[PDB]
Amino acid sequence: RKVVVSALQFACTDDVSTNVTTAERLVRAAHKQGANIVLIQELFEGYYFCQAQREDFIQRAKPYKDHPTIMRLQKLAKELGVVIPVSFFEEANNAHYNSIAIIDADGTDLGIYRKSHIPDGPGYEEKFYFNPGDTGFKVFQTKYAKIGVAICWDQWFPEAARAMALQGAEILFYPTAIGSEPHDQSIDSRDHWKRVMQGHAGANLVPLVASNRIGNEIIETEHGKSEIKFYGNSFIAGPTGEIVSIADDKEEAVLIAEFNLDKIKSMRHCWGVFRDRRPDLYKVLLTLDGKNPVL
Amino acid sequence: KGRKVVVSALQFACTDDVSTNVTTAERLVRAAHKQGANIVLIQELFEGYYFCQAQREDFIQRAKPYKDHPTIMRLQKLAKELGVVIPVSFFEEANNAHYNSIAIIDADGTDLGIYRKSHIPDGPGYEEKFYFNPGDTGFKVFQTKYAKIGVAICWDQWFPEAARAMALQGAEILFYPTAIGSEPHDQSIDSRDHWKRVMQGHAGANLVPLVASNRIGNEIIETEHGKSEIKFYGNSFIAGPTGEIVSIADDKEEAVLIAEFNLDKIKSMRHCWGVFRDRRPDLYKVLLTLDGKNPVL
Amino acid sequence: MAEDKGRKVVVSALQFACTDDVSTNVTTAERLVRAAHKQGANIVLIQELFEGYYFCQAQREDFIQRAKPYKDHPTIMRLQKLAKELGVVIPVSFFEEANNAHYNSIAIIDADGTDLGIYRKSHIPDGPGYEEKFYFNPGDTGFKVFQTKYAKIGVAICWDQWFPEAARAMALQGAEILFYPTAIGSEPHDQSIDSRDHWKRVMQGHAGANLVPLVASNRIGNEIIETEHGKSEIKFYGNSFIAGPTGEIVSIADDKEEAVLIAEFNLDKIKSMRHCWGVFRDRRPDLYKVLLTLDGKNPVL
Amino acid sequence: DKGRKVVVSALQFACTDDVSTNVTTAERLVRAAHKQGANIVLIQELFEGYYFCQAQREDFIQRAKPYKDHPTIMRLQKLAKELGVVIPVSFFEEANNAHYNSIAIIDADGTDLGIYRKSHIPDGPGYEEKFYFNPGDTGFKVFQTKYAKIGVAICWDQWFPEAARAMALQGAEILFYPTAIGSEPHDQSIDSRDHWKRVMQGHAGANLVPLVASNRIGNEIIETEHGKSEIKFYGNSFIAGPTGEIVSIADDKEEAVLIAEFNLDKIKSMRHCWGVFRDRRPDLYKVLLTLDGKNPVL
Amino acid sequence: KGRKVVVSALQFACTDDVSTNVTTAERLVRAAHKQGANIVLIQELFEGYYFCQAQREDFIQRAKPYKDHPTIMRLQKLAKELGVVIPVSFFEEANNAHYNSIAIIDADGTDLGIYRKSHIPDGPGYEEKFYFNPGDTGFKVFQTKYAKIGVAICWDQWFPEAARAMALQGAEILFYPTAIGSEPHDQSIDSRDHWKRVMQGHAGANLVPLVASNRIGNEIIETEHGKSEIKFYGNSFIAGPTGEIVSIADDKEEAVLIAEFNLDKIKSMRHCWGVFRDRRPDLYKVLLTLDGKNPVL
Amino acid sequence: KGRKVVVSALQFACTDDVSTNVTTAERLVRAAHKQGANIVLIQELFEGYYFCQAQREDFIQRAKPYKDHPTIMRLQKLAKELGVVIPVSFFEEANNAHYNSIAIIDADGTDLGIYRKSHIPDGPGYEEKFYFNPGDTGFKVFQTKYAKIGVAICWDQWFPEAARAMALQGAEILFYPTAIGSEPHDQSIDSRDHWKRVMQGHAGANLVPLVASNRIGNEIIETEHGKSEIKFYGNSFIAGPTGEIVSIADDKEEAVLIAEFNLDKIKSMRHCWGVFRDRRPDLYKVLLTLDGKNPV
């Protein structure tokens, strides 16, 4: 069982149809290079608007139901025969989420995952827009494989990766948007960010895919202009956490790595980390302060 | 710029003859429509006297099935003729069950369904518990031609849970037909101020406009223990999304209240304020108890 | 001076003995239906499986083939003509064949002769003398009410009458009167069992708890059936009766006479009494989930 | 005649509106029942005072007390322990802002086994219980006592076959119903006593379990918001067998101690053999979870 | 190459003493274990004579609760000692309901839960409908240390629906404890060949091995109408995944039957045959009727 | 005493010439009738070689519409002449759809309607998938002058659900025209015993007789890869209501199997055994899933 996977890395304008045209052109090229499962970066429908905390930007959200972009990638997914996770800003009555729709090989929409861990701070004011996720971590059974799909900031938490691997995830996927921070140009998070994810891969014995955007984006915030240089470094790690394919910080990229899933599962089962786990001693992970279980 | 909706609260006195009262409601619905109304709200159990001052066997038989109801059917023609949304309050018989109900008529005459009053009041003058099974529809919202609306009934207006339930389901405007006034056992009770404040609270906490239509007039009912009298205090009103009263009637006059809301700006104002983004349903389990400890089955 | 308003309806319970010849028993039924109609009856109730002996004392292959389809049933068709002639409602109890399934059924014939449909016995009894589980699939129509020319009625069959759930299911759906055709008597394996008083009190309890009148028609006579282990006898104990909405018995037959019982009810006054008493206003379905278990803990799928 | 035997008792008495007096009365009669061999003794509903629900008064709501350290429950626990008898104690419960018509089941060793909160709440002239009590939220319960597994419910609950069946399905071997019922102050023509008995006898026969009903006697006048209101409570406390037969019954005005012995092993055997529980059709009972015959409640 | 499992069907005659019969089971389980068995199947209602020839009040009281059942508890010790999976058939009392049930004990002694007999037979010699409520667990599969298995009971074995339900839920092997023999009212009835053919059919249609353990011996029961005799015919067998019988007992002696199955090669063979991807559940709705027309509720 | 019906299973080798095969079918139907048959079953797709081996474009044109089918019409004449029921297997063209189908002809020559094969497999020697859409008729029963019958086709015969569906609706006899033999990929599998066991299973579980007609002979079709060959193993048989084989053919010669059944006695036996009285459809919802969890 040989599933091919791809990481995509492009620049965005602040125009839905031009951006979707970009993803649509890079997904078709992935399929040309033999891709089965194609990953598109976070909130690629537009500029990373979370630098500002503006009332009108909340109204960029749209319902999950009959979503114009989901609907347009389902046709593309079905025609190529590729799995495609679709990042979008979701409105649900008065709730709002940073969410992703998993569209299978036949165009079928298999459901939704809602970003659980929400970042905050200058340039990344995501807590102003998103309710923290209520779906829980999910695995999606696709024609090619069982896949763990979470979103951006979720990639920093070992709990997310572990939860997905416990639920049958043969591969983990993370659509991302990260770069410089507008308040301090001395902050360079690229090495640290790769390292944390490399750790999830090696600890669970599952390959990993991270798609991150590039280019410069200037947002008109409530306090004047704010700029981010997204640093790319979209990559694919193997089940031991090794970097097999890696993009640069500036150029557009279409990554590919083929994995023998049945043999990676024999590698995982023989190492026996899952049978060796001690859930009886992990109750402290249900606390925030290291003593009080949350309700 | 944005979807606009003109809403209206009506306030009038009732005899105990259905034909008269429906004729009265029709006259006021037309006057609201002449002033630009798209959704018009008629007071609770308007077809007759507020009979719940008595606990009488024979009054139970005022109920009628939802199916082919002559007052709903008559008002469906009006809605369609005028292009107006009309929630119609009525006493429902459903086999051996009975409910204080309301059917939502859309601007094209279409009966969109019903809501059965959930919280049932009790005590001298307001013996509703004797007549109505507690509602089993749960809180609802209705997609009309002008807006998603949440309609509940009278006593439901005192419960933040009901307004919150409707808002969570996408209600853009809340409506409460009412029958409230003095209490026959104690002349010192005057609940009008308290009544308004609690509702203003719902409107401000959910950032949605709110409409309340209340009865006026004195009604004297023969009860199992003699005459009982209520002076209904009107005070029908419309409140905006921060709870401010934008239209209000006095305690005796017949009234047609009008108010226009921009529903796209309000949606935008509601999301911006962030309350729905910040709710903690994980910490609200206690609300599924009556006694602060034991969850209900 | 005027009569008290409200729809009146006159109901009747019949009580008779059967032979094992279908023509003789339908002739008996028709004679008694006509006698009931002569006394003013609007709805007449014939006892369970009246077409023959209560054959369920035996567990025999050949007795299963006594079933017949609901479609073009000779007995139903014949009683349809009688109902139309007299202008009376007649529920018709019969053993139904439905491809490979079999049921103990009842067809409700309206006062204009129209077949309004069927109910299939839900609770199936078992044991010496009453081996019904051998013949009948448990009913799959669920509890029903039928809108007749005179009233909305609830009809169930024999063993069903021991279950408060059935009576309440019918009342909840608007049944204004309950009917139960019955075949019950002595038990061949133990002559000390005399269930007649127990039988009455359970049904009177249904009428009182739902505030609806109730009609039970039961068989009389001794019947001997040839079983796989020899002859077995039941003495059917009659006691057909009509009960009012507080459970009071208004008419009752003895254990051996042929009877035509007659009682008039004002359905509008009883409706009003039923609602004022308030039991239906006060019910707690939220606490009744345990009723959907057999063992008090596990809900059935 | 082998098998576990249990002796049950129904008490019937008049109440004043003073708590100390009425509890002294209950203790007198529980001792009289025990002297006659009773193992489980049933005291009538809200016996601590007059049946105050004829009125709808603010101040009457404050007669309620917490379940915790309830003085009447504590006093009767001592008596239960002294005599070795099971004693259900009816009381008006305050639980934060909720209020219930409740009953605490005291075992023969004096242990508080838990509470049942009245589910079906009556309403109308003379019986304005819906003004005082939240409808109960414990659900129907059964309690394992030293003598038997029992099902205890309260007053108006006795009209509902669903409550008896719920208790039977969960193993209840005897059903107990403390009661307060009599005339109705708005219409002297209403006499519910035969209807009342008939419905309970229905429960006993349909579930094949014995049933004990203890009812109040005497005239009571309550000062209501609209003037005096009077009820004459009609007694008729009784004990029914597993076929619904009345085995013991009191009149409408006598103070009474009723006594009945039951063989629970033989009744269990009879119950199972009759087959009603073997033959039930819960797959066809969903309509029971509706009020209107059509719509399942949330 | 793959996960191997050795299964066993046991066959013996019952006495009227419980302990004797559990000890007979214990002796035969140890004999299966000695010959390499991992999962061992004991016949239906093995604790005593097949009492269902009679319809008696006192026989119903032979039932016992699932909780702290002495026979289940004793067999748990044996399961843990030998490291063998043991399904334990028993007559369950559950408040007022009664069932013909079976508890699946895992190789470490753990009680995995129970299955209640779904299809209850009836007629002379087999009056089971008098004793048991139809099962309400539905068909189940259990995950044991050696395999996911489907266990159903006696009469259940005549129904293609039970066997399919278990395989669809992942059963790798079907098990059917049985009590079947002659019929007391008609000596011409010999159902043994028909009985095997139907099960062999289940094995072949689902491509899973099947094990059936049947009783031997003549039993005379005192019924309400005199003596009734059944001659139990044994013929316990184990069938492979195409329905071929690979081990079979005679009609009169004790037997310990043993067979090994490569469950991964069988899984692969089942997947390859493809029957399960080729089913048409969209065309099977009539299976939810009894009469070929009306779906049950 | 009771309705007696004589049924027949025919078995022969096909040539790849339509006329010849139809003439062969006719000869054997007449032979069956001469031995007393009332209902006669001809094997699946008898008009030619079993072509589902290969996946060829020109083979699709062997399909013909249900209306005015020349083989059906000719067999209608034969049914009316002799007074025998004849289910006619054929390759149906219906617009953008094609089906493996069978039309039931009554003893008076009346076309009673059709059933379209429901279960469509894959695999070498039997690539049914490329030629036939999944049947949309559902499982049917047909009332003939002699009995209510249920008919299903080739691959359908592995599915207990189809046999049960027919029996629930009144089928008193089940008919299964088929084509099965070796597999061109590996000559070690011999499925004839597995096949018989599953069908005997359906006869015994539903207490209905069952007739299966299978072809004999070797057949070589030129395909995409190269010459594919199959040896059809015959073994046509008639089973009774307990699943006993009452009549059976070998793997190499023509046969006309005959068996008489008393449908009234069998119906009485079926009901007394009780399986239909004892079914639990309230516990069978999982059967409306493919994966054993989610309804379709």
Author numbering:
A (entry chain G): 7 to 301
B (entry chain E), E (entry chain B): 5 to 301
C (entry chain C): 1 to 301
D (entry chain D): 4 to 301
F (entry chain A): 5 to 300
Could you pull the original sentences from the published paper?
The arginine route involves three enzymatic steps: (i) arginine decarboxylation to agmatine by arginine decarboxylase (ADC, EC 4.1.1.19); (ii) deimination of agmatine by agmatine iminohydrolase (AIH, EC 3.5.3.12) and (iii) hydrolysis of N-carbamoylputrescine (NCP) to putrescine by N-carbamoylputrescine amidohydrolase (CPA, EC 3.5.1.53), with the release of carbon dioxide and ammonia. N-carbamoylputrescine amidohydrolase enzymes belong to nitrilases, and more precisely, to C-N hydrolases breaking non-peptide bonds using Cys-Glu-Lys catalytic triad. The octameric MtCPA enzyme is assembled into an incomplete helical twist, made by four tight dimers with swapped C-termini. As in other nitrilases, the substrate hydrolysis is carried out by the catalytic triad, composed in MtCPA of Glu48 (proton acceptor), Lys121 (proton donor) and Cys158 (nucleophile).
